[PDB]
Design a protein around this ligand. Structure first.
Ligand SMILES: *[C@@H](O)[C@H](C[C@@H]1CCNC1=O)NC(=O)[C@H](CC(C)C)NC(=O)O[C@@H](C)C1CCC(F)(F)CC1
Ligand SMILES: *[C@H](O)[C@H](C[C@@H]1CCNC1=O)NC(=O)[C@H](CC(C)C)NC(=O)O[C@@H](C)C1CCC(F)(F)CC1
Lengths: 298, 296
């Protein structure tokens, strides 16, 4: 099983660059609005504890340089929505896909189109960790790169990149500018919560193993959801929610293995280890493939 | 693993159908390239005489669709294992491109497609035994692999088949297979695979750059003595060019190439002791030195 990203072309057609002074980052051009991180309006003196409201008061439309390639897009209005800036421009992007803005849950995966100066460099698949960080490849200049899923014709944008944490992991917002996790856009050291293993994705991985004929870990027992959750937390696994149980429905139907029976199987793997065996050619339980990713790929 | 952005290639994918057989084609200027086994029926795929099968076909037996629009085929020819269909319409989305044949150990991105529609993108390496560990299903043939430099798309791979072991085989865009494989519906084994040593070293450098360095040591080795151990463990030999290619990473970390070779030697001889590197229980060999630099 490979980490497979969504084709990036519909998002490539929306990437622009946004500059204030010498500060350049990426923005997302949909219809006649460009969305980008608000810290583009920051100097250095500001990034320590920016007063974003006062910094924006000193800005006019004519202070923002928005470019698609080297072609300038005239800004005709501006506003700030949480931690994102919205720049109204005088041209509707002809490459605008059908799209939605969504807020994802920890454990969900998405593709990131890593961009620099409005130019895409690469695409890769990310998982939102339970502590609301991602393990991106994000260098200087990458802010405003976005994360997305594609369903049928429709791009669901779920992430915009803002910052790196002391541990090297990455943090950002949804496209309404609300951070995932307890982070703020200030050049200060911020700690994430201790991370945990994404249980629903491990279960998805065990279902994928069964689908491929690797099923030694299946047992004849079951558990309640509450009993499983209380044990799982002692192993630094996330508790399951009702939505997790439901998104495992399709794989449970495909294999005939009830969700709670698979939970009982995972509980035994936690309490006894792998006994020197492997699953899908791996001694490690994988937690960055969602139930959707398993299906999308199998 | 990071892939190249796929948009320039998405704008070239089309669907090609002959009979009940459908797969993907690549539409550049006024030509569509696709695997020649599109002309086969089930019965044919078992032992096909392609020149015989092809002369029995007319332009109108080929149905090419770019989304909703059918493109009319006005000519066809076969080049090795690829069919070239001339169409009456030029693709305005054709990027600047070249056809290249890649070397084993090199990496490329794959745009997996079904029915002419892009499905996913991922990074692959050409294995030393000329297979690729892909994720391809029924209908993925004609999906291509590529690298992008500046604005130029270098196409290096077109997908044709799966082997019993589950790995994949295909051709360059001139239709010549990578490896000893043939486009016939028969079970085919590959040569013994080896590990791409220069890529393992590059990935160990990436691990150090990210502060994961338990595997380092103060031993050293000559290039030849390292290569003796590598061959024993079915790792590819390391050439002086490989050592030179690793220079930048050596400079960045201050770890001499041959010192990283000594570290790898001890991993081969002792294993990983149930430890991980960059989260992996196994040594990763599908990142090139260039891949590592680009991303670090
Ligand atoms: C594209 O047309 C398709 C892609 C295959 C299907 C499943 N996964 C893939 O990568 N290509 C073929 O189906 C190909 C056609 C021949 C004329 C070359 N045959 C093929 O790949 O056969 C494979 C699926 C079987 C596997 C079982 C076997 F016993 F080993 C014989 C080959
Ligand atoms: C935007 O392009 C940039 C992306 C960063 C740069 C390197 N890798 C990234 O993900 N974001 C910022 O520069 C951001 C701006 C603030 C106004 C929110 N600050 C930031 O991420 O600084 C990081 C690099 C340091 C790391 C060390 C620390 F102690 F945690 C303080 C923040």
């Amino acid at each position: 099983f490979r980490k497979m990203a969504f084709p990036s072309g519909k998002v490539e057609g929306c990437m622009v660059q946004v500059t204030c002074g010498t500060t350049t980052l990426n923005g997302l051009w949909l219809d006649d609005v460009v969305y980008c991180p608000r810290h583009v309006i920051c100097t250095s003196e500001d990034m320590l504890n920016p007063n974003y409201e006062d910094l924006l008061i000193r800005k006019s439309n004519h202070n923002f340089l928005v470019q698609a390639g080297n072609v300038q897009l005239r800004v005709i209005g501006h506003s700030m929505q949480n931690c994102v800036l919205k720049l109204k421009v005088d041209t509707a992007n002809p490459k605008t896909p059908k799209y939605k803005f969504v807020r994802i849950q920890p454990g969900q995966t998405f593709s990131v189109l890593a961009c620099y100066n409005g130019s895409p460099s690469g695409v890769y698949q990310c998982a939102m960790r339970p502590n609301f960080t991602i393990k991106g490849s994000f260098l200087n200049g990458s802010c405003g790169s976005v994360g997305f899923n594609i369903d049928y014709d429709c791009v669901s944008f779920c992430y915009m990149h803002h910052m790196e944490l002391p541990t090297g992991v990455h943090a950002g917002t949804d496209l309404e500018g609300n951070f995932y996790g307890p982070f703020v856009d200030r050049q200060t050291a911020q700690a994430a919560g201790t991370d945990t293993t994404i249980t629903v994705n491990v279960l998805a991985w065990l279902y994928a193993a069964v689908i491929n004929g690797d099923r030694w870990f299946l047992n004849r027992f079951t558990t309640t959801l509450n009993d499983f959750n209380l044990v799982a937390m002692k192993y630094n696994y996330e508790p399951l929610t009702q939505d997790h149980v439901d998104i495992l429905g399709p794989l449970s139907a495909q294999t005939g293995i009830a969700v709670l029976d698979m939970c009982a199987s995972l509980k035994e793997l936690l309490q006894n280890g792998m006994n020197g065996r492997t699953i899908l050619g791996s001694a490690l339980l994988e937690d960055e493939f969602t139930p959707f990713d398993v299906v999308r790929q199998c």
